[PDB]
Structures are given as structure tokens and as C-alpha cells.
Amino acid sequence: MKTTRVRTVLNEKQLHTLRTCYAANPRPDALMKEQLVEMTGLSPRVIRVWFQNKRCKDKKRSIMMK
């Protein structure tokens, strides 16, 4: 009851993690997905939607190395 509160933020800490991820591959999966969990300190729920939205917003900003 009243459990599963909301405690998942998004800033330079988590962003940096996912950030280096995309530079390696635009389509991860159950494989690397497991490691990403322990690395972000939060459930995989947030992980799924992040990649999704990123594709739409990344209409041009998506070059590897500048």
C-alpha cells in the first residue's frame, strides 16, 4: 500500500550512462539491457521509454564522434 513510490531522476548522472550507450549501438536488447539496469540504479521501465523517445527527437543530432 502506498509502496513503489516515485524515486527516479534524470540528470548528468544517468544521462552520461545511456549517452555512451547510443554511441555504441542504436538498438540494444535483453542482452546489454540487464547490465544497464545495475548501472542506472533503477528499474528497466525507464530504460525502455528512453530509447524510444530519443529516436524521434534525434531527427539530426545523432553523429558518432565530431
For 24, 26, 30, the CA distances from 65, given in Å and listed in that order, are 11, 14, 26
Q: What does the angle CA 28 – CA 29 – CA 32 come to, to the nearest 5 degrees?
A: 75
- Mind listing the domains of the chain with CATH numbers? 1-66 (1.10.10.60)
